[PDB]
Design a protein around this ligand. Structure first.
Ligand SMILES: CC[C@@H](CO)Nc1ncc(C)c(-c2c[nH]c(C(=O)N[C@H](CO)c3cccc(Cl)c3)c2)n1
Length: 332
């Protein structure tokens, strides 16, 4: 028969993984659903081709090392890894993960969420983020397409490509554009909460400049303290040259939303990251009272730390480290 192919891209994952079907894609790869003849279940296989670029090699090694170390109910894990038996032949890496029914991007495209469903989804994102942040790791790309869901509404965070030890424009914090920290992930969670409440993105900017205008159009003009930071000159002089913009109240933008949901949203969507609410205070907020449970909210045993500076290593050395990291999944 030979190896299977999906939309041009070859998928040399057999004979264990057969009956392949397209489910998603990325900047340097493809995601496919496949049947596992060992566990007798369908799984998700993430193919990635990162060896042509040094940045992609860093992301691949960071993603593999983080997900293998991490073990949480609201975070996607790695079940198996397939790659060529020799380093010279390795051009692709296949990460086998648990298959989920849908994601929040697909769900908000077709379904209207009840307050209890918005409350339960937000809790699981923050429960998962509590574990990521306890390990001193930043996701840096939290969005509805990276939040996977199953039949029984169980949520899982995926795509740890941009993850780092302490992105999509619409869920990007103003400090990334103005000038990184745990607070940039909370901003993204705020953007996700607002999208669950209206089935529309709160800041759908077409470019980095239009993105800042959409934020100022709701939050109002920034104060002297909000601008008093290590901000870039171009962005600082641009925001100062703009006319005065009034703050739109949260109850006016979301008329029939829960008052507690809007109080937490305000604390998550705060321009100043220092004044922005943290993952623990967000979980203890009265909006997530019926789900908050410090007893069943695990944290990472120790903070994450890389043994070597990956930014200084060339793509040739990073390829060797990727080959060595994926070796324990090879037969023998
Ligand atoms: C069938 C429904 C889909 C989600 O809608 N199910 C599902 N189930 C499990 C998983 C692990 C996934 C899944 C979703 N995105 C990804 C995933 O890893 N996506 C990133 C881009 O966001 C990616 C993909 C390929 C290459 C690169 Cl460089 C990066 C995995 N998707």
């Amino acid at each position: 028969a030979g190896p299977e192919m999906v939309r041009g891209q070859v998928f040399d994952v057999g004979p264990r993984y057969t009956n392949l079907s397209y489910i998603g894609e990325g900047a340097y790869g493809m995601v496919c659903s496949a049947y596992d003849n060992v566990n007798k279940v369908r799984v998700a296989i993430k193919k990635i081709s990162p060896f042509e670029h040094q940045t992609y090699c860093q992301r691949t090694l960071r993603e593999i090392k983080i997900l293998l170390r991490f073990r949480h109910e609201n975070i996607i894990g790695i079940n198996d890894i397939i790659r060529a038996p020799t380093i010279e032949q390795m051009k692709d890496v296949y990460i086998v993960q648990d298959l989920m029914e849908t994601d929040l991007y697909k769900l908000l495209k077709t379904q209207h969420l009840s307050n209890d469903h918005i409350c339960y989804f937000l809790y699981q994102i923050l429960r998962g983020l509590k574990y990521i942040h306890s390990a001193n790791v930043l996701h840096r790309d939290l969005k509805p397409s990276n939040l996977l869901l199953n039949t029984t509404c169980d949520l899982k965070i995926c795509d740890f490509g941009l993850a780092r030890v302490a992105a999509t424009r619409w869920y990007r914090a103003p400090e990334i554009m103005l000038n990184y920290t745990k607070s940039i992930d909370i901003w993204s969670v705020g953007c996700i909460l607002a999208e669950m409440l209206s089935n529309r993105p709160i800041f759908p900017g077409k470019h980095y400049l239009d993105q800042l205008n959409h934020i100022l159009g709701i939050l109002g003009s920034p104060s002297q303290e909000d601008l008093n930071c290590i901000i870039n000159l171009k962005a600082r002089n641009y925001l100062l040259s703009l006319p005065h913009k009034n703050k739109v109240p949260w109850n006016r933008l979301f008329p029939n939303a829960d008052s507690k949901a809007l109080d937490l949203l305000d604390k998550m969507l705060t321009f100043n990251p220092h004044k922005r609410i943290e993952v623990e205070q967000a979980l203890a907020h009265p909006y997530l009272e019926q789900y908050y449970d410090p007893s069943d909210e695990p944290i990472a045993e120790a903070p994450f730390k890389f043994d070597m500076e990956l930014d200084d290593l060339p793509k040739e050395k990073l390829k060797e480290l990727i080959f060595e990291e994926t070796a324990r999944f090879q037969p023998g």
